[PDB]
Design a binder for this molecule. Structure first.
Ligand SMILES: *[C@@H]1O[C@H](CO)[C@@H](O[C@@H]2O[C@H](CO)[C@@H](O)[C@H](O)[C@H]2NC(C)=O)[C@H](O)[C@H]1NC(C)=O
Ligand SMILES: *[C@@H]1O[C@H](CO)[C@@H](O[C@@H]2O[C@H](CO)[C@@H](O)[C@H](O)[C@H]2NC(C)=O)[C@H](O)[C@H]1NC(C)=O
Ligand SMILES: *[C@@H]1O[C@H](CO)[C@@H](O[C@@H]2O[C@H](CO)[C@@H](O)[C@H](O)[C@H]2NC(C)=O)[C@H](O)[C@H]1NC(C)=O
Ligand SMILES: *[C@@H]1O[C@H](CO)[C@@H](O[C@@H]2O[C@H](CO)[C@@H](O)[C@H](O)[C@H]2NC(C)=O)[C@H](O)[C@H]1NC(C)=O
Ligand SMILES: CCCCC/C=C\C/C=C/CCCCCCCC(=O)O
Ligand SMILES: *[C@@H]1O[C@H](CO)[C@@H](O)[C@H](O)[C@H]1NC(C)=O
Ligand SMILES: *[C@@H]1O[C@H](CO)[C@@H](O)[C@H](O)[C@H]1NC(C)=O
Ligand SMILES: *[C@@H]1O[C@H](CO)[C@@H](O)[C@H](O)[C@H]1NC(C)=O
Ligand SMILES: *[C@@H]1O[C@H](CO)[C@@H](O)[C@H](O)[C@H]1NC(C)=O
Ligand SMILES: *[C@@H]1O[C@H](CO)[C@@H](O)[C@H](O)[C@H]1NC(C)=O
Ligand SMILES: *[C@@H]1O[C@H](CO)[C@@H](O)[C@H](O)[C@H]1NC(C)=O
Ligand SMILES: *[C@@H]1O[C@H](CO)[C@@H](O)[C@H](O)[C@H]1NC(C)=O
Ligand SMILES: *[C@@H]1O[C@H](CO)[C@@H](O)[C@H](O)[C@H]1NC(C)=O
Ligand SMILES: *[C@@H]1O[C@H](CO)[C@@H](O)[C@H](O)[C@H]1NC(C)=O
Ligand SMILES: *[C@@H]1O[C@H](CO)[C@@H](O)[C@H](O)[C@H]1NC(C)=O
Lengths: 196, 242, 188, 49, 147
């Protein structure tokens, strides 16, 4: 939670620096109104107090400007948080890495001091295995392309498998679709397609 | 722009019969020059009386230095969050068999001390990057009256970025290798290998067109892609307005 | 106050001083021996202090920016400096970098994650006798990925990860009274 | 402006070097200036001339 | 003291402007990070987020204090007029395509995918039926082939 603590620390530090800046003379004989008004009458004290007024007003202007910068930063962060809540808590985001590594499934908001926390639950494929693939299968001259998934061989046979999980099933005319003769495709390999 | 009335009818649709594989180059700033300022050297150059008078403004000067330090750390953070998305430094396979696609100009050149690609070399040569200086030259040949020497003599130093351009090139090369050898899978966890033709087939199925049209036109597509790269190779080589 | 050196400038007979862009005098004609002398500040910015945080140790390292390690003492004027500043000016731990010269940390050929960034791909840390080390950062593990025109990798399992990420939303609302701050309670 | 510094790298100001000697470089002129001719003048001028 | 105040104010002005520009650059950097995550590491469906046309890939290239993206995109080029119809009344039932549109070259009708002209003959698996063929507006007569 370094971000939220940094925000709180920044605000507190800015206020404390503003208090500390009242010790500056700004060219006047002293940084205290009382000393100026007691040593000098308004005759000569007006100029000193005006110098002090100008300096302290400039200090306030500096503080307000820095606060506006930080407010813009926080507004950008808040807009991002609102977009995340709308697109990840209220929905399922297809944007890659927008909500956590892996394929986003859900998100759970949790309040935090001056901030929000998202628990992005994600699907991460873990145990991979090598396989020999092929873009298409030439059955009897025609080229078979899978509908969804890829053609995969364990060494002997071929199966259609969905892309993010190993659930092979035997080649079939409904799993695939035909498109033209099987001579133009590069990498095509021979096998038979089962037809119910 | 051009006036272009479009035909419209309740029973008339226009269907494409071909395509072009365009390559568009777009640029984004990521960081800016980190800078540091010495109040004492700038305001009260080396006089002790003026520094003693300035001591009562230590709060102001601490505030300024804190702000500039925050800016510098922010620049380093920006560069890291842009380029170091993945912490697995993949290296391109030695053999270039990507179904006819030619990635020569967007991969590292082994025949250069820096590990940049051709397009990167053009990009770095198209920007001057003038703030680079060695102290001692300012102490020596100052009759030239360089501006950087004045900035340094008035306490306005420029800090170097954390990530060297070679390191950024390494990160970019890792991203390219993962992209062309594993597709989108290396971003969602481990990098899973796939032939590039099947990868571009996945992309074609993504944009809403069947994958077969790729395999029936693969060579053509590859040529188009290469041609598009060639356009970039000249578009960044003649003009400097990009 | 500053450092005087000799230079070349063509001063017309009615000119004695020369001024730069910042209006500070930079060239002066010596009245006794007719010659031009250039005034430079006797210090320079570019000194950075690297340290593990106190409550751990008091050792530090010093980065002198854009100076060769051969010419660090003349640049820093170590002759006039205190004895405690001179030990950090030259020694056996002197290390040259693209950013500048680093003193007080031994150069290590190994690579780690960045603990205290320095610059130009150099990061420093506090090893375990105890001392400060400086090393080139590690960008991550080298991992060559197998690739072939007829080889695909398929997952057989999965993990349901949960990642926690935090975003600021608001900050402390504040209000300021000019009268109470500038002119506390005085009517004048 | 603190007694504790956390882990990191800090840009630091210039307090390390201090001056130790002074140099004077004036023209070498020995002719004392005519004070006795403007102050010890027998006669001054009228204010209009 | 007057000089000190003036020069300190000059420094404050410079630091403020630098903060403004830092915020601008941070916005640009956040956009660049989002682009790298969503276009280099993936395929973006967002229109014109990564180049004109349908995004396919993106290739990052480092640049001085910046990044460059080579958005490769699919742009359909050679278009042709056709006469369409929302549905086909076969024998009372209305046929709607699964993916693609019904297109006629003047004589026959085919189902064609939306972004490319690859017509194939009408078939019961290419289409699906839904109710009688009287409520639909623009429906036209033709026969659907059944294996
Ligand atoms: C896959 O099937 C095709 C035909 O369906 C095979 O093509 C034959 O190749 C031989 C020479 O190797 C020719 O003599 C035949 O005329 C071809 N057949 C036809 C119908 O043209 C192809 O060889 C098969 N691939 C493998 C590895 O066996
Ligand atoms: C689709 O567009 C491409 C290029 O825009 C065409 O490819 C060219 O076709 C002509 C004749 O067929 C050849 O002379 C060129 O060599 C081809 N260019 C390349 C890079 O290969 C293609 O013919 C078009 N296809 C259709 C159906 O319109
Ligand atoms: C990819 O494109 C380039 C340019 O068309 C091909 O030619 C090479 O161009 C570079 C210049 O950057 C030269 O250094 C190489 O010597 C050229 N190659 C040859 C064989 O002369 C390049 O060949 C293409 N890649 C492949 C695999 O063909
Ligand atoms: C398309 O098919 C429908 C019936 O399937 C046709 O509807 C017929 O229209 C005529 C008058 O034009 C009526 O006499 C018939 O009774 C209708 N048939 C039925 C089953 O109700 C329709 O005409 C056909 N459209 C065209 C242009 O030929
Ligand atoms: C021959 C005149 C030379 C003029 C030199 C000009 C400026 C430098 C000397 C300035 C002061 C002039 C003398 C006044 C002495 C006042 C002492 C006093 O009694 O309180
Ligand atoms: C897949 O094959 C390559 C080369 O044979 C090998 O490096 C890799 O480890 C294999 N994948 C797994 C999960 O073992
Ligand atoms: C491949 O799969 C088939 C069907 O399950 C099986 O009969 C065969 O033994 C497998 N061969 C290898 C090398 O895995
Ligand atoms: C795949 O690559 C190997 C060598 O790298 C080659 O022998 C083989 O012919 C290639 N096959 C295809 C379809 O490109
Ligand atoms: C005196 O002045 C002259 C020229 O103005 C110079 O050459 C000389 O070095 C100076 N010193 C002495 C002792 O003459
Ligand atoms: C000082 O450093 C620069 C670059 O590192 C180099 O060109 C120069 O030769 C060095 N000079 C000496 C005396 O080492
Ligand atoms: C690091 O490597 C260089 C040469 O590769 C060698 O000279 C140097 O001694 C090594 N560093 C240490 C501490 O040994
Ligand atoms: C000026 O005149 C008085 C009276 O004659 C005399 O005492 C004094 O020495 C003179 N001073 C100068 C500088 O001539
Ligand atoms: C399609 O039809 C309209 C009107 O007949 C015509 O303006 C348009 O040019 C045609 N499309 C093409 C590619 O010619
Ligand atoms: C329309 O398509 C069919 C089948 O290809 C063809 O027989 C017929 O000649 C075509 N007619 C026109 C006008 O294009
Ligand atoms: C389409 O528009 C034309 C005239 O613009 C009209 O004659 C025809 O009936 C309309 N057909 C449909 C299905 O709306």
């Amino acid at each position: 939670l370094g971000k939220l603590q940094d925000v709180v620390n920044q605000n507190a530090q800015a206020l404390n620096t503003l208090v500390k800046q009242l010790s500056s003379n700004f060219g006047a004989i002293s940084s205290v109104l009382n000393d100026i008004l007691s040593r000098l009458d308004k005759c000569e004290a007006e100029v000193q107090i005006d110098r002090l007024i100008t300096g302290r007003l400039q200090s306030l202007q500096t503080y307000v400007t820095q606060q506006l910068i930080r407010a813009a930063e926080i507004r950008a962060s808040a807009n991002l948080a609102a977009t995340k809540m709308s697109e990840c808590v209220l929905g399922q985001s297809k944007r890659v890495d927008f909500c956590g590594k892996g394929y986003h499934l859900m998100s759970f908001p949790q309040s935090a001091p001056h901030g929000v926390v998202f628990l992005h639950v994600t699907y991460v494929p873990a145990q991979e295995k090598n396989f020999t693939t092929a873009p298409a299968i030439c059955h009897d001259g025609k080229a078979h392309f899978p509908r969804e998934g890829v053609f995969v061989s364990n060494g002997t046979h071929w199966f259609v498998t969905q892309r993010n999980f190993y659930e092979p099933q035997i080649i079939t005319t409904d799993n695939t679709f035909v498109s033209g003769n099987c001579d133009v495709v590069i990498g095509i390999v021979n096998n038979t397609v089962y037809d119910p | 722009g051009a006036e272009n009335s479009v035909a419209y009818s309740n029973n008339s649709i226009a269907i494409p019969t071909n395509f072009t594989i365009s390559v568009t180059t777009e640029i984004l700033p990521v960081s800016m020059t980190k800078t540091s300022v010495d109040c004492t050297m700038y305001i009260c150059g080396d006089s002790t009386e003026c520094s003693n008078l300035l001591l009562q403004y230590g709060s102001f000067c601490t505030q300024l230095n804190r702000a500039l330090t925050g800016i510098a750390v922010e620049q380093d953070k920006n560069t890291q969050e842009v380029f170091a998305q993945v912490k697995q430094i993949y290296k391109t396979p030695p053999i270039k068999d990507f179904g006819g696609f030619n990635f020569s100009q967007i991969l590292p050149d082994p025949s250069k001390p820096s590990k940049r690609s051709f397009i990167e070399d053009l990009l770095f040569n198209k920007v001057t990057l003038a703030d680079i200086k060695q102290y001692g030259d300012c102490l020596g040949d100052i009759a030239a009256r360089d501006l950087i020497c004045a900035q340094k003599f008035n306490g306005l130093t420029v800090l170097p970025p954390l990530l060297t351009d070679e390191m950024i090139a390494q990160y970019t090369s890792a991203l390219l290798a993962g992209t062309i050898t594993s597709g989108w899978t290396f971003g969602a966890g481990a990098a899973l290998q796939i032939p590039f033709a099947m990868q571009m087939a996945y992309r074609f199925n993504g944009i809403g067109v069947t994958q077969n049209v790729l395999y029936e036109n693969q060579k053509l597509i590859a040529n188009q892609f290469n041609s598009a790269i060639g356009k970039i190779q000249d578009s960044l080589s003649s003009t400097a307005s990009a | 106050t500053g450092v005087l050196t000799e230079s070349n400038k063509k001063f017309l007979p009615f000119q004695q001083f020369g001024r730069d862009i910042a209006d500070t005098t930079d060239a002066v004609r010596d009245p006794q021996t007719l010659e031009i002398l250039d005034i430079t500040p006797c210090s320079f910015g570019g000194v950075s202090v690297i340290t593990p945080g106190t409550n751990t140790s008091n050792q530090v390292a010093v980065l002198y920016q854009d100076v060769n390690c051969t010419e660090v003492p003349v640049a820093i004027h170590a002759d006039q400096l205190t004895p405690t500043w001179r030990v950090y000016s030259t020694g056996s731990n002197v290390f040259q970098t693209r950013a500048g010269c680093l003193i007080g940390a031994e150069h290590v050929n190994n690579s780690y994650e960045c603990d205290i960034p320095i610059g130009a791909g150099i990061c420093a840390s506090y090893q375990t006798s105890q001392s400060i080390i400086a090393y080139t950062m590690s960008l991550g593990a080298e991992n060559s990925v197998a690739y072939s025109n007829n080889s695909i990798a398929i997952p057989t399992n999965f993990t349901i990860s949960v990642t926690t990420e935090i975003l600021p939303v608001s900050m402390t609302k504040t209000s300021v009274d000019c009268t109470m701050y500038i002119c506390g309670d005085s009517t004048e | 402006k603190s007694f504790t510094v956390e882990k990191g790298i800090y840009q630091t100001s210039n307090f390390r070097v201090q001056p130790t000697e002074s140099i004077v470089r004036f023209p070498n002129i020995t002719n004392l200036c005519p004070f006795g001719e403007v102050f010890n003048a027998t006669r001054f001028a009228s204010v209009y001339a």
